[PDB]
Amino acid sequence: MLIKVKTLTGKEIEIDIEPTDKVERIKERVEEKEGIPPQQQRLIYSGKQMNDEKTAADYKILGGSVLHLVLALRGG
Amino acid sequence: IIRGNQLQEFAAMLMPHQKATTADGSSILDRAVIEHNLLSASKLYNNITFEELGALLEIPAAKAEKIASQMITEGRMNGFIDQIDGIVHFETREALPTWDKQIQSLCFQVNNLLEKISQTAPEWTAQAMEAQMA
Amino acid sequence: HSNIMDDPFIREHIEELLRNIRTQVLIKLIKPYTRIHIPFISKELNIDVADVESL
Amino acid sequence: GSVSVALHPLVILNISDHWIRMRSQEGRPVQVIGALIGKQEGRNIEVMNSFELLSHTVEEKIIIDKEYYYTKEEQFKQVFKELEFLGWYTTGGPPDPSDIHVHKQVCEIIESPLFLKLNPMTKHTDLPVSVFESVIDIINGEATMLFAELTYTLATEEAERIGVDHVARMTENSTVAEHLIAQHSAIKMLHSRVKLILEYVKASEAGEVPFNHEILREAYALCHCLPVLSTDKFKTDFYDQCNDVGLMAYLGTITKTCNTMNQFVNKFNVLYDRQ
Amino acid sequence: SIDEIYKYDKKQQQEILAAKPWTKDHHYFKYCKISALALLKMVMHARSGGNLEVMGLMLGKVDGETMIIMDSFALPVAYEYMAAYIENAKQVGRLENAIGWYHSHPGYGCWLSGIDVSTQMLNQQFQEPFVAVVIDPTRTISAGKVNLGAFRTYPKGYKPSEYQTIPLNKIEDFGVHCKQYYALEVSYFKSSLDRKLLELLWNKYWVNTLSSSSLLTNADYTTGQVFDLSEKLEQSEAQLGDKLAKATRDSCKTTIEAIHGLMSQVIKDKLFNQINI
Numbered sequence A: 001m002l003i004k005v006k007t008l009t010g011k012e013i014e015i016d017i018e019p020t021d022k023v024e025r026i027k028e029r030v031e032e033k034e035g036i037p038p039q040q041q042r043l044i045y046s047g048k049q050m051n052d053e054k055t056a057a058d059y060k061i062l063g064g065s066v067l068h069l070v071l072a073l074r075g076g
Numbered sequence B: 001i002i003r004g005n006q007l008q009e010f011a012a013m014l015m016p017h018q019k020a021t022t023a024d025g026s027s028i029l030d031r032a033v034i035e036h037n038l039l040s041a042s043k044l045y046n047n048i049t050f051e052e053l054g055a056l057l058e059i060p061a062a063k064a065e066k067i068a069s070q071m072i073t074e075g076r077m078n079g080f081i082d083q084i085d086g087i088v089h090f091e092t093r094e095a096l097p098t099w100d101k102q103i104q105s106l107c108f109q110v111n112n113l114l115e116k117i118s119q120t121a122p123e124w125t126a127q128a129m130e131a132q133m134a
Numbered sequence C: 001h002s003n004i005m006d007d008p009f010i011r012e013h014i015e016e017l018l019r020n021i022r023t024q025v026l027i028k029l030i031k032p033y034t035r036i037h038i039p040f041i042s043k044e045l046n047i048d049v050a051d052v053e054s055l
Numbered sequence D: 001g002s003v004s005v006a007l008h009p010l011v012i013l014n015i016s017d018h019w020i021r022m023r024s025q026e027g028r029p030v031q032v033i034g035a036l037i038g039k040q041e042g043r044n045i046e047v048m049n050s051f052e053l054l055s056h057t058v059e060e061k062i063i064i065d066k067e068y069y070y071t072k073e074e075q076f077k078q079v080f081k082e083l084e085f086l087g088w089y090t091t092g093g094p095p096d097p098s099d100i101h102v103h104k105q106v107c108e109i110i111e112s113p114l115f116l117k118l119n120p121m122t123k124h125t126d127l128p129v130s131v132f133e134s135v136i137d138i139i140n141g142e143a144t145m146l147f148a149e150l151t152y153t154l155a156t157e158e159a160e161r162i163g164v165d166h167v168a169r170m171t172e173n174s175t176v177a178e179h180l181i182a183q184h185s186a187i188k189m190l191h192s193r194v195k196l197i198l199e200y201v202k203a204s205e206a207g208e209v210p211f212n213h214e215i216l217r218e219a220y221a222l223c224h225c226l227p228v229l230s231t232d233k234f235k236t237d238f239y240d241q242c243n244d245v246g247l248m249a250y251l252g253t254i255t256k257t258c259n260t261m262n263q264f265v266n267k268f269n270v271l272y273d274r275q
Numbered sequence E: 001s002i003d004e005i006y007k008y009d010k011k012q013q014q015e016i017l018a019a020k021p022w023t024k025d026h027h028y029f030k031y032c033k034i035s036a037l038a039l040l041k042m043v044m045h046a047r048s049g050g051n052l053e054v055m056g057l058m059l060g061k062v063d064g065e066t067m068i069i070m071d072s073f074a075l076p077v078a079y080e081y082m083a084a085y086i087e088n089a090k091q092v093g094r095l096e097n098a099i100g101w102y103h104s105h106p107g108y109g110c111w112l113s114g115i116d117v118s119t120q121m122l123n124q125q126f127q128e129p130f131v132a133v134v135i136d137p138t139r140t141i142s143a144g145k146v147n148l149g150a151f152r153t154y155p156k157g158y159k160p161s162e163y164q165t166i167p168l169n170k171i172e173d174f175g176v177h178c179k180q181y182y183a184l185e186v187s188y189f190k191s192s193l194d195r196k197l198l199e200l201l202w203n204k205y206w207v208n209t210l211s212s213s214s215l216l217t218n219a220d221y222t223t224g225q226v227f228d229l230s231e232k233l234e235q236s237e238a239q240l241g242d243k244l245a246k247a248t249r250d251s252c253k254t255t256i257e258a259i260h261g262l263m264s265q266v267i268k269d270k271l272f273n274q275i276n277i
């Protein structure tokens, strides 16, 4: 519903979504928060990188899951 | 250094094609053994003359220098040849680096001798150093 | 001699050869030496002592 | 070696940093539990980099939180290809029954576990002796296994040696003193070793200890080797080095004098000639 | 008791992170305090790759103008493995977060490459406290001293030498990307107490110290230092007609190192050569 994404340094951002929202929507929300392009940014939950095609059905938290943001260069 | 007194037996089990001559009166067997002797002698010598190199490896002077220069230019052997005085210089130590390694060997002898004292008399050794500093 | 040094396209360039190969032999021969004898070089290069100095 | 245990200096620093971080975090010193890994070659220990393995220390009992260690196993396997679990470390004095219980828990994971007990509260000169590991004594009835201390070695690589030297006192107390204290300590320990060897020689001469024909022969060889490099080429090289350092000092005393003269003329130009 | 570097104060860290004092002034960070464990693990990983290149993250905090580093963990490598291993920072129980990344230059000096400066620009842009460490394994092994590489970069579109040993190849990359980053003064901190007590294992060596073979181990380092000092002094002279103070300091340190080596050699000669004459 309303999740928090933390960077490596520890900066926390609180972004609000809906259960049917996509991971591209997550990246766009982070873009509107700071300005990170979606292709230069990686999202991790439970130590596993999210795939870019699944609509957060197994990421059901209902209580603001903590996401991990990792900056990466374009295309590696 | 392998002499001729321990090579006659080895020629017995050699295959017949391995006893061929290299158009110089020397078989294949006693061609890689003079190269081996030359490389091994580079570790026991800092510099050797042509005459004494041939008095130890046979083949006195015609090909003793030729083999020495042939091993070099190929990376097989380190050294340089001064043809005017007929001396092959193998490898020399720069004094100061030798001083450090000789000091290290001296300190290692102290440590090794220390273990021997403790092994023989563990009771006498233990009480020794504690009162020594105080 | 009648198969190599016949046409002018190879005879003219035979002078450039027999000198490059001699140069390569000379370079390798003097590699492990700090002081070498010029007459000693001449016997290996199969040329005159004066020609060794010019080379 | 008789027992083939080789500890690395990085492990000791790891345990010290762990203990200090926990002590600062929780205010008071607290017992910590770890996990030593390394390379085993049949009869070799060779401990290396250790990781946290926090587990639990609840009340008086240690719970089996080794699932976290299981997750850490594949993590450390990604950066350490040739490294495997060997044992665990702790902070305290003599072994305790709680240590026995934790060791029993650890033997479930591995067949040959060690037990390091780095003591941070020690106030005696020689270093706390690392690991008290055991082959486990079995008697009729209860196992009641104890720990049979065996010796350890401090084998270290070149990078570890350079790092340890950098952390140690090397270059308010001036650089001359810091550079000279290291030499003073090294010469002091060498002098102690030589003095104890001389004491053994004197004891053998008087008759306190039995006459060992080989120790005195080695001592005679050591005495004969004492004048190291006394050649004329060594003296020439040493004097060349001394002259080079003297010139390098002259070039730089000149620089300092030039700097001070520049400061003096800067102060002089604003005091007498006001232009 | 000093210490006080530990005991991570969460409230102060959040306050200093929310204040963001380095946004106003670009030259805020000037001092980098690497820990003993940080150096040990960094150098071990750097040498555990030989001529190959290694890279990992380094954890720490920020206090005023200084950046303190308490720990550092290696990485498996660009693929998913590195990103999966990054979760270690928040998986373990540790309050130090992450402060930067370290990466080795095996034989290519200590400078920052173009890709390196671009990654540092990105990291600083979206993760405000970040520093890059560019230590060199081959140089510390050969010369016996550790060379540091704290090389925080400048922001994009902003305008405002030491280890110049790269002979031919990569010196071109050095020249183009030279004003895009500024070095940080590295000042090591020892926690004292436990680690100061346990540093007696260095005294256990006692043989590499007694036979150090200095003044030839790092002869190339001293020649490079003198080569840098030459145009440092030329720049001081050109400005004069305070760079002169910096040149004098560099000359003093180089001369002090040379005299320390000579003192060690003299002590060794008195200890060993002047016995049984």
Ligand SMILES: CC(C)n1nc(C(F)F)cc1C(=O)Nc1ccc([C@H]2[C@@H](O)CCCc3cncn32)c(-c2ccccc2)c1
Pocket (backbone or CB within 6 Å): A070, A071, A072, A073, E053, E054, E055, E077, E101, E103, E104, E113, E115, E116, E119, E122, E123
């Ligand atoms: C901190 C890490 C995760 N990171 N974050 C971001 C940023 F985009 F977020 C970006 C990065 C990141 O891995 N960068 C990077 C870039 C370049 C190299 C190599 C590259 O040029 C190839 C030539 C050698 C070289 C000399 N100097 C940097 N390199 C490396 C790298 C260094 C050592 C081992 C493996 C890789 C890492």
Ligand SMILES: [Zn+2]
Pocket (backbone or CB within 6 Å): E103, E104, E105, E111, E112, E113, E116
């Ligand atoms: Zn780089």
